[model samples]
Target: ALPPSPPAVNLGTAEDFVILAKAGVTNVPGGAITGDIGVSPIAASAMTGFDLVMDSSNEFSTSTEITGKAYAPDYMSPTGTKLTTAVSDMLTAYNDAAARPVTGGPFGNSLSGETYTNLGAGEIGGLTLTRGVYTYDINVSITSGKVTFHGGADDVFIIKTSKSVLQAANTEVVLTGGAQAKNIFWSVAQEVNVGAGAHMEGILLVKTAVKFITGSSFVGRVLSATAVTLQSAAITAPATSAPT
Candidate 1:
């Protein structure tokens, strides 16, 4: 049987549209979601930490560390609109910040400023990404994608994912960042397949085991079913280090 008619949704402005787009959160399609999911966390200091309450029924599962505030003060409707308004404003601020180059010395580099160079091609074997917020909108769902962050020499990469998942797929997604296996955020769901060569920094709010390959390292914590595996021969030679 067809799912109930999509609820009437008023996202307010274009910014909300962007947030909803990147996070892959929506009520347009419905189905069973299966597969290895990965995500970055919402930094604790983000101006408008994500508001998962807006779509509280959507299920999430991941093995990556997830940080930041999951719910805005005004999550559910009635007052939820006010929260979304704040979220919209927050999205605008993030966009404004993303347009600039690296400044503010070391910590000045914002994660949101860092973006995946191409939505089609993966990073070459040698590449580095600085720390900060990197936002991306999802146009497709249930497909396999890969992001490899080769930390030149020795370095760490902080990554976060604050998107929504609808009709989750049994997708195999890989995110390679950080040299020392530092903090990474994958809030919401579970059922993730983390490669062995991955160094996870940060916290994971999941419901399954986070399989780690050989050279894989973990620096933060996993808050789920505690199902993590250490793979063998998964680590490779050290690449150039990226700034954090």
Candidate 2:
């Protein structure tokens, strides 16, 4: 029998910011983000290239390339205070997801049979994975077509990588079987990169930085310990009918 659904990680205040980073976030005159970005324990100046215009209230800032606002700890009172909480919540969420057990199947654990460790030398292209928790000891790279996630709306999918995640140019991460992007999670220990002209789905819970190459597309939350570099990338919000 398939394993019972794993409990979803509670994002707390972190969910309010689609892009939460500790060091900062940057835009290369381009990145198009549909949601808010937050930098906590860091000043607004850490966010580069956004051409930010601070609100008169000094609570938040806006950017031409972003559809929402940019938040920093150096902002006004409530903003600074709110960000401190959000960043803390983000870290807590990351730990929660990472702490889940990895063993697979009904006889041994609650994970699905699809559970994998160090799968395919950390290269997962042309593979269809179902509801489960997976782990990789090496860097995960996707350079080709047909990387797919198959699951129901209630299912949760988590992939933990010891190193980085690199998605190649023009590639896309697909979903089938009524799978929802919000239920998918990718946890990386190092960096996360979305190659130019590529697309990604799922929440990114990373220990380090995340990079969106020029013209890349994404649908998910990016919570990072370090920075997020965006180059004209378009990050759509979750649960949208549009999957482009």
Candidate 3:
């Protein structure tokens, strides 16, 4: 039998900030971001790796391609204001997710409400999880293989971890049974590292920094309280159904 689905966490205005970091966003060459990227509470100089060549129309051009707009504290006119609002909304969303009640056991421990084989040492590989709330006191690691989510489009999955999240090289998070990436949430207290060539799917609300190594790809938003570093990565916002 499938576990009961968890309630969806509201993202509010922060949803538009596909890549939002409080400190800064640093991207290396060969990165492609398909949604708006913003950094706030930090100077524009903190956003490195992209050549922000100013144009006469109060806009900045970049060699590193971003399909959506780029926003920094020093941006002119609407960019700055939009970034400020997005930053505030990101904080609100992070706080809301952090304040949610713990609903399960810590890593490597026996689950309380739900029953499943022990995922040794917080390693979540080769397991097919249904929709529900998962809480881990220790770090969450996906060192090898694939972790699958089996659910419908309306189902939601929430993973709350007190420590960092690590995905090893060449690993993946797969979704089946009509599962959608937009309904998955990873509330991480520390840093999040998606290793080289790995594929990640979910909205990551990280307290500290987030790093996407070379050739890594993600199909969701990354809202970090601190900095965000991207190498040769591809980050695209998940598609969602229109509001009724």
Candidate 4:
């Protein structure tokens, strides 16, 4: 027998924007994003650090080297309207993920369970997890070493945290057994911080903010409620095709 598959959480129109932030999206020099980025309800000025150029069609180009389009409310034409829709959809997706029932609880504390096997609240390093719905009432931290996800391509992993997600330097997330980044979701209530030189994968739907430290690399979407600050990071959207 195999583990039961987790329910899928759709992102709707929000799926189009790989980095969608409510208050703003800011990046440090040398940051690279390989997907569409947007900020909503706030003016384009809220997005800073990128040397931006405007085209005749009101689209934006940047020195930070974004491989996809950029949108903000300050844009002149349909770009602004599209950003508004995308932001709304992002919020909807966040809410939907937040409402999921707690399947796995308090993984890293005094509480013991099969899910907490070799894991705790302090540091999560060198652990391989299967597809499932996991929840934490407090904060979750990942220090040195690597975390691996092993499962089928269609398998889903949902991690819900009440406080924050902290990934330390020199850590990595590896996927095997046909696991796809699109099927991994993180629903965080407070904030997320990826330490310098860390690497991560999954869709991060954060309620407060997300900050990628210098030289960090990320693969997947960052749908943040408040803002996103990137420092010389590399972020790319995952492949869209359904896994076989």
What are the per-model numbers of colliding residue pairs? 50, 1, 0, 2
* lDDT (tens digit, per residue) of candidate 4 on 1-244: 3447678788988889788998988889897888888888888888888777766677654454787777888787777778888878888888888787655443434354545322455355777777777777878788789988889989988778888999998799899999999999988999999999999999999999999999999999999989999999999889733341
The TM-score of predicted model 1 comes to 0.27
1-244, model 3: which lDDT tens digit per residue? 4556777777876788678888988889878888777788787787788776554555443445676666777767777777778777777777777776654443323454443322345788887777777777888889999999879989988877889999999999999998888888899999999999999999999999999999999999999989999998999888732431
Inter-residue clash pairs, candidate 2: 31-232
Checking candidate 3 for backbone clashes, the offending pairs are none
What candidate 2 gets wrong by more than 4 Å, as runs, is 103-115, 240-244
- lDDT of all predictions, in order shown? 0.29, 0.84, 0.80, 0.82
lDDT of 2 by residue, 2-65 (tens): 5666777788988887899999888887667887888988788999998999999999999887
Winner on TM-score (2 vs 4) = 2
Per lDDT, the best of the predicted structures is 2
**How well does candidate 1 match the true structure, expressed as C-alpha RMSD?**
17.2
Worst 10 residues of 4 by lDDT: 109-118
Task: Please report the candidate that would top TM-score against the real structure.
Answer: 2
C-alpha TM-scores of all predictions: 0.27, 0.92, 0.87, 0.90
Better of 1 and 3 by TM-score: 3
lDDT of 1 by residue, 77-125 (tens): 3333433454454344333333322223222134434334222222212
